[PDB]
């Protein structure tokens, strides 16, 4: 099937482009229902949770904002008190009350019932011995006026001293008064947020587990000091939320204690539904960020997010990436976020990463790389690839098939040379399975077929050259000239059906770039899987060329449908292609049976 401009247009129409946008900020976690409901259960249950999702989602910002709206009962006073001259314990009294116990004690069970042991060991023997006893006053760590918002402690740098506190040494000697608190102490009564990656990098996971499982919170000591203070464990009063990518957790998840300690998974989706409601939420969010946003600017950014997702019906959920693009656009718009400033910011990003493609197109233009984008040839096709370096530019890859009389072999030269990956190899085997099983009249196939990419790659992976390879092969067998103005992309199964491929937009745009650089003929285009219709979010220039009749997109479901377009004839209605393929096989069989 041909895809008209009308079927290919995916962009949002813009009315009153320059009108200033005016919209309230959406709630935290908008379109992230799963993750919010998980966090809500963790908050209600007092459970530890982990926030998981790809980078640049704004996971941290969404979390802090959400936690800012909670209300806990006011955090107790938290303090170290000595139970001895070499022992200390962590204590909580009700809020405000430690300042009285400090004034009382500065008077070198009075009304502090819960602070019993510290007084009950504060006794007497200065008199009985005359022994000079000044390291007996309590050390307040924290205190707070209200539990709204609760304590919220984000420590991105999860070293032992930042988590557990420190011992300073004055000249050696130390005492209760010299114990500095850590993030764990500051988060009591509220929330501690750490990054999974930091716990691994800093090697502090095992100690963190000990803090949560056993209440062991050990202020960091130095290798020098002649002695140290013993620190009693204490009941940990906090909720911990870990943040990281799905891969960051996997190191931690191989430890059964992680599953045990962190029961609630709060997972962010990498895409949201593409809806009026999420476009509107994006608008409100951007305005709250400080952007001066026009309607057309909002619309362009919304469509760029759809395109980032390579889905017409979904939008990229990475708000931090949308923001960063918006920041560039704002500079290009003189402070104003407009349709033009967005398009131009997208175009400047491609320009900044274009050197490699400029080098490539120049080599093609000079004939150092040999490409044909017009005319016809037997056993040759332009397949499409992406280079495995960011930003993953698409390019045509010329591919040839040669047939000889022989004993049923389909060879990939690139695979035999050791250049192809496992899935690439699977694609070749699959084509072999299709041809053997399709053409059985002579017994086993009377041909050997060798496939080669015309340029040499360090490696090729993926299955999406399968369609190009199968059409090349059929063409070589049938002696069928194929159009070189149409590139071909598609994986194939053993039954000759065409399956969806990755990076479809890059692939299509890369052939168009090559056609444009060599001069558009008016008949060029791409054949691609019908299964990829939902992924097509082509750039303006390609859509305009297709609307102009200068470029053409064809969607197929079977390998034969591709071959028909390429060879300019039907399989049947015979004089069709199928009888020419059969005629080729009979010729090869006769040569092979001397």
């Amino acid at each position: 099937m041909r895809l008209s401009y009308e079927a290919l247009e995916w962009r949002t129409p813009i009315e009153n482009s320059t009108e200033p946008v005016s919209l309230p900020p959406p709630p935290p976690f908008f379109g992230q229902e799963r993750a919010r409901e998980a966090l809500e259960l963790a908050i209600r249950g007092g459970f530890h949770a982990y926030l998981v999702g790809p980078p640049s989602l704004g996971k941290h910002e969404a979390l802090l904002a959400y936690l800012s709206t909670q209300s806990v009962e006011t955090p107790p006073d938290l303090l170290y008190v000595p139970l001895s001259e070499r022992k200390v314990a962590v204590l909580t009294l009700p809020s405000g009350q430690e300042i009285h116990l400090a004034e009382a004690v500065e008077g070198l069970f009075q009304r502090f019932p819960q602070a019993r042991a510290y007084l009950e060991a504060l006794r007497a023997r200065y008199a009985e011995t005359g022994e000079p006893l000044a390291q007996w006053r309590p050390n307040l760590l924290t205190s707070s006026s209200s539990g709204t918002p609760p304590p919220i402690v984000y420590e991105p740098y999860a070293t032992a001293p930042r988590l557990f506190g420190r011992l300073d040494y004055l000249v050696w000697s130390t005492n209760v008064s010299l114990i500095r608190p850590g993030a764990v102490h500051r988060a009591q009564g509220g929330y501690l947020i750490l990054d999974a990656l930091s716990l691994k990098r800093e090697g502090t996971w095992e100690a963190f587990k000990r803090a949560l499982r056993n209440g062991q919170v050990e202020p960091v000591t130095e290798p020098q000091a002649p002695a140290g203070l013993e620190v009693e464990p204490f009941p940990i009063q906090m909720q911990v939320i870990l943040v990281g990518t799905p891969e960051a957790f996997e190191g931690l998840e191989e430890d059964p204690a992680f599953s045990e300690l962190f029961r609630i998974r709060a997972e962010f989706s990498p895409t949201l539904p593409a809806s009026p409601e999420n476009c509107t939420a994006l608008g409100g969010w951007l305005l709250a960020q400080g952007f001066q946003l026009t309607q057309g600017g909002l619309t362009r950014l919304y469509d760029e997010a759809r395109r980032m997702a390579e889905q017409r019906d979904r939008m990229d959920a990475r708000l931090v990436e949308i923001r960063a693009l918006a920041e560039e656009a704002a500079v290009l718009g003189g402070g104003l976020l407009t349709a033009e400033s967005v398009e131009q910011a997208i175009a400047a990003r491609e320009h900044r990463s274009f050197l490699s493609e400029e080098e490539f197109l120049r080599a093609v233009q000079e004939g150092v790389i040999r490409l044909r984008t017009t005319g016809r040839a037997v056993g040759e096709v332009n397949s499409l690839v992406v280079v495995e370096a960011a930003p993953y530019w698409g390019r045509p890859a010329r591919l040839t098939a040669r047939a000889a009389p022989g004993r049923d072999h389909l060879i990939s030269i690139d695979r035999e040379a050791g250049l192809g990956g496992q899935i690439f190899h699977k694609a070749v085997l699959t084509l072999a399975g299709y041809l053997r099983s399709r053409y059985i009249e002579h017994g086993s196939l009377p041909v050997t077929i060798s496939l080669a990419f015309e340029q040499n790659y360090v490696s090729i992976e993926g299955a999406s050259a399968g369609l190009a390879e199968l059409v090349a092969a059929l063409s070589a067998i049938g002696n069928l000239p194929l159009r070189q103005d149409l590139a071909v992309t598609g994986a194939v199964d053993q039954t000759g059906k065409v399956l969806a491929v990755g990076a479809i937009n890059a692939k299509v745009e890369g052939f168009f770039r090559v056609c444009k650089a060599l001069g558009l003929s008016g008949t060029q285009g791409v054949i691609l899987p019908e299964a990829n219709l939902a992924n097509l979010t082509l750039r303006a220039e390609v859509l305009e060329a297709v609307r102009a009749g200068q470029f053409h997109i064809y969607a197929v479901e079977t390998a034969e449908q591709a071959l028909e377009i390429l060879a300019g004839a039907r399989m049947e209605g015979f004089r069709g292609l199928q009888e020419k393929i059969r005629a080729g096989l009979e010729a090869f069989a006769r040569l092979e049976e001397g």
């Binding site: 397949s383 499409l384 690839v385 992406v386 280079v387 495995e388 370096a389 993953y392 390019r395 890859a397 690439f424 694609a427 790659y457 360090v458 490696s459 090729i460 992976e461 993926g462 299955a463 999406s464 050259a465 491929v501 990755g502 990076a503």
Partner: peptide
């Protein structure tokens, strides 16, 4: 170049 089909 390393590539992906």
């Amino acid at each position: 170049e390393a590539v992906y089909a």
